[PDB]
Coordinates of C-alpha atoms and ligand atoms in Angstrom, one line a residue:
X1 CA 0.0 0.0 0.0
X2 CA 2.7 2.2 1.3
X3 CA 6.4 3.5 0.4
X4 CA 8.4 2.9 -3.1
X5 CA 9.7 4.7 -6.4
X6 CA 7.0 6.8 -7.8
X7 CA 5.0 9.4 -6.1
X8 CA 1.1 9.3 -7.0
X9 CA -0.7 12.6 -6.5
X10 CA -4.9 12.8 -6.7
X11 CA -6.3 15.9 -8.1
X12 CA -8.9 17.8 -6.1
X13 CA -11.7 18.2 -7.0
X14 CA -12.1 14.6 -9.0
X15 CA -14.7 12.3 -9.5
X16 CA -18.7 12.6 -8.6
X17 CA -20.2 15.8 -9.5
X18 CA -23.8 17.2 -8.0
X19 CA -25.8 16.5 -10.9
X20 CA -24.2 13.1 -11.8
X21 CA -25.0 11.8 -7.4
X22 CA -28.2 13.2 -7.9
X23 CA -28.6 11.3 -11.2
X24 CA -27.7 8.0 -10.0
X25 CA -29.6 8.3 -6.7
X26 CA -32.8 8.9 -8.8
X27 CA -32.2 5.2 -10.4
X28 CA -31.0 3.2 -7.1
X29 CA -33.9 5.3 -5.4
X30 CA -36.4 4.2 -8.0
X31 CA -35.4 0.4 -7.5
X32 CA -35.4 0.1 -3.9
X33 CA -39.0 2.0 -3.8
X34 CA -40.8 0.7 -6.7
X35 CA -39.0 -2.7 -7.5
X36 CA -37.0 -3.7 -10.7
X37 CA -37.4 -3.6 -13.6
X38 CA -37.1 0.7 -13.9
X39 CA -36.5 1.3 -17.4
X40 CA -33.6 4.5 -18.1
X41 CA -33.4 6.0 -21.4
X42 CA -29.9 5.6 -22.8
X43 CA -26.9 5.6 -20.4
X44 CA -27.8 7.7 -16.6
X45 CA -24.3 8.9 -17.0
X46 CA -21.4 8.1 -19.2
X47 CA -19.4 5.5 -17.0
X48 CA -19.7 1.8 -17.9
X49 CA -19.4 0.8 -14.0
X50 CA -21.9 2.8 -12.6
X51 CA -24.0 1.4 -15.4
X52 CA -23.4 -1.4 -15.3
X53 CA -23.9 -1.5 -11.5
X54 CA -27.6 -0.2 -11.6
X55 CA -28.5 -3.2 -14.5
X56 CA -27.0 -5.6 -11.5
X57 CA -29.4 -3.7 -9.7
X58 CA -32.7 -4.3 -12.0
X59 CA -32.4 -0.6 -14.3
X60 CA -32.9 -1.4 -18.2
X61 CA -30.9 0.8 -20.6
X62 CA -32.9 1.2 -23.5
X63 CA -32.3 3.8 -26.8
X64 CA -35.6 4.3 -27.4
X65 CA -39.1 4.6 -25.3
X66 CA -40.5 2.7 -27.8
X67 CA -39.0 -0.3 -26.3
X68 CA -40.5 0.6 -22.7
X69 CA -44.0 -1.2 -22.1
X70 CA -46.8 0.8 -20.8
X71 CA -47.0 0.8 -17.0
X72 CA -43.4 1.2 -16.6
X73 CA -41.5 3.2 -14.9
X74 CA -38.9 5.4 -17.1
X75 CA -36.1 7.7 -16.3
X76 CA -33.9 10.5 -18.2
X77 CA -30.7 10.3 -18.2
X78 CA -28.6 13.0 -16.9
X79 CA -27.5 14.3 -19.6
X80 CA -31.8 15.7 -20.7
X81 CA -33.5 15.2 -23.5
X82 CA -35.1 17.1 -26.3
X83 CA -39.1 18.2 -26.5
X84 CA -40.1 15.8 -28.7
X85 CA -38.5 13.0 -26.4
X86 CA -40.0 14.9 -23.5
X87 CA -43.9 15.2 -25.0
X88 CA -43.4 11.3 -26.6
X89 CA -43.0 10.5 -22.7
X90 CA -45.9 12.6 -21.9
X91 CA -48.4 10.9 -24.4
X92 CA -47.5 7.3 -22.8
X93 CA -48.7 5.0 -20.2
X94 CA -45.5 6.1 -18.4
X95 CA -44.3 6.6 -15.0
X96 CA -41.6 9.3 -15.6
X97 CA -39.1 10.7 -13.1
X98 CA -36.3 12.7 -14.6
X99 CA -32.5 13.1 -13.9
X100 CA -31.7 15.9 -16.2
X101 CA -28.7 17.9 -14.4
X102 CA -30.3 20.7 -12.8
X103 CA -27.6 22.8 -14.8
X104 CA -28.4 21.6 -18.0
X105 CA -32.3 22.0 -17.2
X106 CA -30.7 25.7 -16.8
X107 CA -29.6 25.5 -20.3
X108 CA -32.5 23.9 -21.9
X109 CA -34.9 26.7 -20.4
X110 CA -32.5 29.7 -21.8
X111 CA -33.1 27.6 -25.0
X112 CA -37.1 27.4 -24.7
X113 CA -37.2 31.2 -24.2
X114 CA -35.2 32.2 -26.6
X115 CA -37.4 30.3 -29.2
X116 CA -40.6 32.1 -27.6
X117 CA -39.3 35.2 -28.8
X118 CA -38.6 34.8 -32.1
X119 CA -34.5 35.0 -31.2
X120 CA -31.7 33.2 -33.0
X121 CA -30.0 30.8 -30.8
X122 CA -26.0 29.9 -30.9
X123 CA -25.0 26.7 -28.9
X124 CA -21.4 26.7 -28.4
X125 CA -20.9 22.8 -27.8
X126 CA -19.6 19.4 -30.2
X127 CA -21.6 18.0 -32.6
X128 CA -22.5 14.9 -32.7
X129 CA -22.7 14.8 -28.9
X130 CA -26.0 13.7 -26.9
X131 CA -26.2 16.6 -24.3
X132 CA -26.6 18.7 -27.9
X133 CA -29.4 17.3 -29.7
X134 CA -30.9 17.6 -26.1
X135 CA -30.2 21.1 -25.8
X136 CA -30.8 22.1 -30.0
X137 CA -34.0 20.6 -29.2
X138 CA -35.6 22.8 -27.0
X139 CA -35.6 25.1 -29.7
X140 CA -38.7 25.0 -32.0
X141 CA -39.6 28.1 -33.6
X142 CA -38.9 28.2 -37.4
X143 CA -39.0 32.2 -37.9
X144 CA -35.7 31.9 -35.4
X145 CA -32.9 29.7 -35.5
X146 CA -30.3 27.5 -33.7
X147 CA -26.9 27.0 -34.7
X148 CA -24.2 24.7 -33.5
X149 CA -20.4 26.5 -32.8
X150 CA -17.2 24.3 -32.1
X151 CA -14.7 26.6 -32.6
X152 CA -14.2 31.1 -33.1
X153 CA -13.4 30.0 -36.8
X154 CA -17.2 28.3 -36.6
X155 CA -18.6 31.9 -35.5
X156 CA -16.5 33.9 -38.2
X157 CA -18.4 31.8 -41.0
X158 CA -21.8 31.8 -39.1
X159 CA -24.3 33.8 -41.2
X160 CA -27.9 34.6 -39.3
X161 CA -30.5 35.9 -39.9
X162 CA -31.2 38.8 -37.5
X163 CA -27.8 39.4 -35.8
X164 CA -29.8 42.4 -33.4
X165 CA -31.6 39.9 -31.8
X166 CA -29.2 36.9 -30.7
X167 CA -28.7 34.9 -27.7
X168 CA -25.9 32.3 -27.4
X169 CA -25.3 29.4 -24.5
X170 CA -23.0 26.4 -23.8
X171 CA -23.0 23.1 -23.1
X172 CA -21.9 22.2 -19.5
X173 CA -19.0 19.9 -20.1
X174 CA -16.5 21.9 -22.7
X175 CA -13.1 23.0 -21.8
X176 CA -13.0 26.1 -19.7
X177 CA -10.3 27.7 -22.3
X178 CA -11.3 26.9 -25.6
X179 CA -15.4 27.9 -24.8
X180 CA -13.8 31.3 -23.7
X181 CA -11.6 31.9 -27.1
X182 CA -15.3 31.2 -28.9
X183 CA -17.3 33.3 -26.4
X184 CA -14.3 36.4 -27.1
X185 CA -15.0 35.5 -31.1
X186 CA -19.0 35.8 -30.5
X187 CA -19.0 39.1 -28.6
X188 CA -16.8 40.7 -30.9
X189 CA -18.8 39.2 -34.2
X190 CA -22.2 40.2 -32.5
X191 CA -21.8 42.5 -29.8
X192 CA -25.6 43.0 -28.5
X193 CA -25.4 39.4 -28.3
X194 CA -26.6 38.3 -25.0
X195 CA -25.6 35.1 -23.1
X196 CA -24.3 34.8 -19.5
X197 CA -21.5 37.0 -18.1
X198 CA -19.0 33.8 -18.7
X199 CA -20.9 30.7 -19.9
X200 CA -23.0 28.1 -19.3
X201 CA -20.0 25.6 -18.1
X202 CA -20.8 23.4 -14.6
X203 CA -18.5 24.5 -11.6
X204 CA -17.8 20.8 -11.7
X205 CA -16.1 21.0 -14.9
X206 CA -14.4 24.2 -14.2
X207 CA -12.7 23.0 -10.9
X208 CA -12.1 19.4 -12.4
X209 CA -10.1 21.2 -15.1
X210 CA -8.1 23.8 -12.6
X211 CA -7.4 21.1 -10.7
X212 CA -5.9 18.7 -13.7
X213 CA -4.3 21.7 -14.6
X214 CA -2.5 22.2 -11.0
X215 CA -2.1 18.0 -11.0
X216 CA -0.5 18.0 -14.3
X217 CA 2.1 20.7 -13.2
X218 CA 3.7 18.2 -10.6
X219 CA 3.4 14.9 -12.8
X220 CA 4.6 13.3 -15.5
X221 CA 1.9 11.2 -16.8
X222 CA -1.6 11.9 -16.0
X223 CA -4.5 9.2 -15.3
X224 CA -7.9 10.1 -16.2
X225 CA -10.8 8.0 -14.4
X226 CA -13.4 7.9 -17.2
X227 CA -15.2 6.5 -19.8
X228 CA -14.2 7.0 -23.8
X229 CA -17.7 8.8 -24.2
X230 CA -17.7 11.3 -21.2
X231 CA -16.7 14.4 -22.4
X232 CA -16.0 16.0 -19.3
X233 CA -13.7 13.2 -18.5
X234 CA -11.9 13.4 -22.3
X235 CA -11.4 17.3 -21.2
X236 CA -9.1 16.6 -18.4
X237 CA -7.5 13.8 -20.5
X238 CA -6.6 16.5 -23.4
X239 CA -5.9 19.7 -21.2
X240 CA -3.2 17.4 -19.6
X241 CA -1.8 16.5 -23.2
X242 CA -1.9 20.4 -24.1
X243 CA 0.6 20.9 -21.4
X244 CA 2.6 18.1 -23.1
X245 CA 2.5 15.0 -20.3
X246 CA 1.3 11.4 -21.2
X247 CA -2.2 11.5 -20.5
X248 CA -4.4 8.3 -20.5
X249 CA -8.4 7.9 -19.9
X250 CA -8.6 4.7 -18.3
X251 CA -12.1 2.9 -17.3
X252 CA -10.6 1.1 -14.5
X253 CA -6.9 -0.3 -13.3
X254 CA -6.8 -3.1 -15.9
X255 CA -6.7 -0.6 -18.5
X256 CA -3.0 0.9 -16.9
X257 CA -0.1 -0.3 -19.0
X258 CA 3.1 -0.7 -16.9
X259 CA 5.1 1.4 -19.8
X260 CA 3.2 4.2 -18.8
X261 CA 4.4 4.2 -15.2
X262 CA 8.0 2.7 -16.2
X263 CA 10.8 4.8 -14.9
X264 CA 8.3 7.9 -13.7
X265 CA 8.9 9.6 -10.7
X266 CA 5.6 11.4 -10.1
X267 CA 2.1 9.9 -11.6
X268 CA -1.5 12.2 -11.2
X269 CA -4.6 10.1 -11.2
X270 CA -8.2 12.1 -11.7
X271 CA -11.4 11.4 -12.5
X272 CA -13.6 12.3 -14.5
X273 CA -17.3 13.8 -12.7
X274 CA -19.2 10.1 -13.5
X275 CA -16.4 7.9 -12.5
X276 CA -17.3 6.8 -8.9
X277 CA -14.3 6.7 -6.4
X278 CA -14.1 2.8 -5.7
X279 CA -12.4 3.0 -9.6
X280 CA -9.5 5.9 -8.3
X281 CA -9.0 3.7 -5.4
X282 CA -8.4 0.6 -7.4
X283 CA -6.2 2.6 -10.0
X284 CA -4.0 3.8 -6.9
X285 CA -3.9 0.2 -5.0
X286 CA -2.4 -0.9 -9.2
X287 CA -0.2 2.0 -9.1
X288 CA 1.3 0.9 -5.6
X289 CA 1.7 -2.4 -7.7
X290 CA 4.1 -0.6 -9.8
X291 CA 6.2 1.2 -7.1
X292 CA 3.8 4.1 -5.8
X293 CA 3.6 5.2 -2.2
X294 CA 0.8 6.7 -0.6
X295 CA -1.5 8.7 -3.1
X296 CA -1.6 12.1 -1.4
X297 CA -4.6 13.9 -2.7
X298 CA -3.3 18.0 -3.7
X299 CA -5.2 20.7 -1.5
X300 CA -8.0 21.8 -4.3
X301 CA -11.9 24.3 -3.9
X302 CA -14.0 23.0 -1.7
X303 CA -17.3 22.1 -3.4
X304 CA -20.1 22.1 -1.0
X305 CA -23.2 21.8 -3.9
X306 CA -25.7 18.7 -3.5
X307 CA -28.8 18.5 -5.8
X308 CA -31.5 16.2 -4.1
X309 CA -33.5 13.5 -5.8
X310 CA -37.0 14.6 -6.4
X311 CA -39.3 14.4 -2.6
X312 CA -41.4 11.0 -4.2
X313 CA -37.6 9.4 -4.7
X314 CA -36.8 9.8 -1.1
Ligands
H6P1 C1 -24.9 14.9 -17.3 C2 -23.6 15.6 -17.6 C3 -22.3 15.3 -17.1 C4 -21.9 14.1 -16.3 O1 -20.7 13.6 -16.9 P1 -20.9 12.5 -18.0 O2 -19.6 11.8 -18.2 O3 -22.0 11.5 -17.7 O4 -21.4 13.3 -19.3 P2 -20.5 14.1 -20.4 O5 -19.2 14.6 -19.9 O6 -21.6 15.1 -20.8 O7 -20.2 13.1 -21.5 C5 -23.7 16.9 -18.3 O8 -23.7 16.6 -19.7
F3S2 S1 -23.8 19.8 -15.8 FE1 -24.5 18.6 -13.9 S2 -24.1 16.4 -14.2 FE2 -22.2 17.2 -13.3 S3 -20.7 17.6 -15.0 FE3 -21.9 19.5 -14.5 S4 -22.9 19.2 -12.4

């Protein structure tokens, strides 16, 4: 457990986020009241373990709530869902409880208005991405319009259609620095624009990224907790890369190949906010395998933010 070679340093803050506890407390909640099966549309959060724990526990992942019988109980994940999946729900024989991240809720509502009034809409976020087509789908007005940025090159080649009467938002998960170099690009491009003062990103993922960044000043090779479709979690993996260390997202400690840890004197482990800790603690008991001493976790913010489950999941 104990003393040996390489030093292993934990981020802080890693790991569970508000949303994402809140989220899989909705399913285990659901299943100890009601019973399994409690059906979840698509993955509750992007981590294969913790999904895979709640089908252990009785929770079906389906794609589609056309594979959910009537009578059944069915839950969003936490990453929300569009209106038409939304009002589909509504028109069936459906017991629906919903784990939409109060934070992207926040989004999805700035979205809504904005299509009430007739405004154009610019999502900075990734295509092809689930929280998007969640978010782009809020919008429903066809006088307006909602656009899709990535990049400040994206908004110097956007043409609208009304450019006095824009709004933009974000998705929750991007990296901190590259959503500001876009926000900069929009403000300048469209300057009655309005938005939030900074932008829609989760303090989860802006103090998971300040402390990778602090994390990945000290180590040499940096270990991401997290699976190959959470974006949050590939954010840490790459801002780690950008300061030029190996960086590796790893779904658990089988993944950790000992040439990564060969003949390194200081290894960060993080995670990712849907990687559970039991994973980090495994990853740092594989580590010690390899010649680590005691993990000592890095003083990081203190987050104090819980989001309950909703009163009938108590
Ligand atoms: C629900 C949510 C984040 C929790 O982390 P996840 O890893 O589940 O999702 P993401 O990073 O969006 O792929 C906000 O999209
Ligand atoms: S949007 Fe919500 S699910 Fe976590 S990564 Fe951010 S608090």
């Amino acid at each position: 457990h104990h003393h040996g070679s390489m030093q292993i340093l934990l981020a802080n803050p890693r790991g569970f986020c508000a949303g994402v506890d809140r989220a899989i407390s909705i399913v285990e909640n659901a299943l100890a009241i009601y019973g399994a099966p409690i059906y979840v549309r698509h993955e509750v959060v992007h981590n294969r373990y913790v999904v895979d724990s709640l089908r252990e526990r009785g929770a079906i992942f389906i794609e589609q709530i056309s594979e959910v019988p009537d009578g059944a109980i069915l839950i969003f994940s936490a990453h929300g869902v569009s209106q038409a999946v939304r009002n589909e729900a509504k028109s069936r024989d459906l017991t629906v409880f919903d784990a939409t991240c109060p934070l992207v809720t926040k989004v999805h509502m700035e979205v809504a208005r904005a299509s009430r009034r007739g405004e154009e809409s610019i999502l900075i976020g990734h295509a092809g991405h689930p929280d998007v087509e969640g978010t782009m789908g809020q919008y429903s007005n066809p006088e307006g319009g909602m656009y899709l940025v990535e990049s400040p090159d994206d908004v110097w080649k956007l043409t609208v259609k009304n450019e006095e009467k824009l709004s933009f938002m974000t998705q929750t998960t991007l990296s901190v620095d590259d959503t500001s170099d876009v926000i900069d690009a929009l403000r300048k491009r469209f300057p009655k624009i309005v938005g939030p003062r900074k932008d829609d990103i989760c303090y989860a993922t802006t103090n998971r990224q300040e402390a990778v960044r602090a994390l990945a000043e000290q180590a040499e090779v940096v270990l991401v907790v997290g699976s190959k479709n959470s974006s949050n979690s590939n954010r840490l993996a790459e801002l780690a890369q950008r300061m030029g260390k190996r960086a590796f997202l790893i779904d658990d400690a089988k993944d950790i190949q000992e040439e990564w840890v060969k003949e390194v004197k200081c290894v960060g482990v993080t995670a990712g906010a849907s990687a559970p800790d039991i994973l980090v603690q495994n990853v740092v008991a594989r580590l010690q395998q390899l010649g680590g001493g005691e993990a000592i976790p890095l003083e990081g913010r203190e987050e104090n933010i819980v989001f309950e489950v909703p009163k009938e999941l108590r």
